[PDB]
Amino acid sequence: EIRDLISEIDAKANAINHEMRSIQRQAESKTKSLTTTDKIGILNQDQDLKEVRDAVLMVREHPEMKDKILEPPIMTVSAINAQFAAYLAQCVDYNTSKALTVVDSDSYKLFANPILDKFKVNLRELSSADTTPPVPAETVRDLGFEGYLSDFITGDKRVMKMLCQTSKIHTIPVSRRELTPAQIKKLITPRPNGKILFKRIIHGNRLVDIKQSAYGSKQVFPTDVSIKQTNFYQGSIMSNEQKIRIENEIINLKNEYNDRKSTLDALSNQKSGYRHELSELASKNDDINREA
């Protein structure tokens, strides 16, 4: 019975070891409601991002590259909410989102070749280009926008400056509300100087690219694109209700499984106690036999 109990409690403790493993996982999941603790895991989602992960690991391994080559915007930049994350992912091209940022031209000459020879990754050099917004943020609020896309994102200032130069996020006004057709018509109409105020605007779930023809009568034409939801650039992972709709539902089914497992192993603990009681009663009977 003792060796059977040894196997029973070893199996109970093995089930408890699996149960404790599940506890670690669910505890990590609940505390992972906020931005991912490590972003090296975001690069494990796609085969194209594994080479970017290996290049980031090489940059982390070489101390000389740490301040000269910066990690990609998908890891270093986070939007204040999930909706601004969708706006950022629609405005920044995927290759720029996964590109390493080189701080200066000398760093490009010294460290671009060793990375490009080993990994097929995109590099973006920081330029001296001015990143001033086309109008003050008060005038943007008067036009019905909450602010520029640059105002609703946080991250390394150098990587944000690179995104401002390549994707012009500091020039894109953003409103979570849809603008009225009269407001949109005022924004598309060129000013008396012939220039449109904003080339790209975001309102509600739509990104409007206002293009003025470089040729002919300089006709202005808008192009409207529905904004897709994204799990990348997401400082707020799947918003809050949406995160609960997926994560909470699935993780809590797994958590009820975990509770069942723990209670089954606690019942195995009760059975060990019953085997212990029976073993203690048998030991008492053995003591009575020894007295006899």
Partner: protein, 288 residues
Amino acid sequence: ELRTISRSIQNKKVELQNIAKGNDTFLMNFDRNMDRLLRTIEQRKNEFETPAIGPLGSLVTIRKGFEKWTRSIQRAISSSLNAFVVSNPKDNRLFRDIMRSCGIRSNIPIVTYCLSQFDYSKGRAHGNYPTIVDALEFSKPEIECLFVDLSRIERIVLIEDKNEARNFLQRNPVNVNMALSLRDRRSGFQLSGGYRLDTVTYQDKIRLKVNSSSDNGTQYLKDLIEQETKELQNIRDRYEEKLSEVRSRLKEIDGRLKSTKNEMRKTNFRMTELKMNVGKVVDTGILN
């Protein structure tokens, strides 16, 4: 993943059969309900001041000799290929209501533009390299002018070698905004300003007409589904060879577990021998 791959290959094969007509619909490259949307536009054409024109990729064909550039060109003009053109804001509202009634799920850009022919000769790239304009054939001259305005196709050059393309752009060639370079069948290079090099993955679905017979691509892709079954097997068994290595590690530790079980059973036999020895008859009474 590999199931999806072979299946998409086969559906593309049957879609080029639908270039003329058939079961799996060819326009499916833009949206599953695209055939329904176009029929509803034609049925309600009298309600439009100018009927909505699109999807633009259906009005553009790759010229013979530029077939190798199809995926690279499509990646460069991918925003424009899915677009529809409407002459005025009223037709734009009517078109959005028809899109809602037809159940379109794809994000379709709507361009409000008055189609006009204009001279863009001054804007053409100057060089020995062909542009996207030279690689394409347009159903109407106004559609060619629209791609010049929307995507500056007259300023995008096609250069096979990446270093040659970088060297050409570094010289600041007149009227060149970007160079497209080839890398492999799944990806290419987009170069702007001679310093920016972007590695771009090609989209699986083709949204440009190719003057090659559907059988060329589909049946060359029939031998290429032979090669894609090669892809499935390779990926699956490299992961399974990985699985085999790790499960051989598992069997090694199981034999170590079996060896520990044998040691434990021997210890159990030895403790059983000990308790057998404890309970043995004592022959010391005559000795005492």
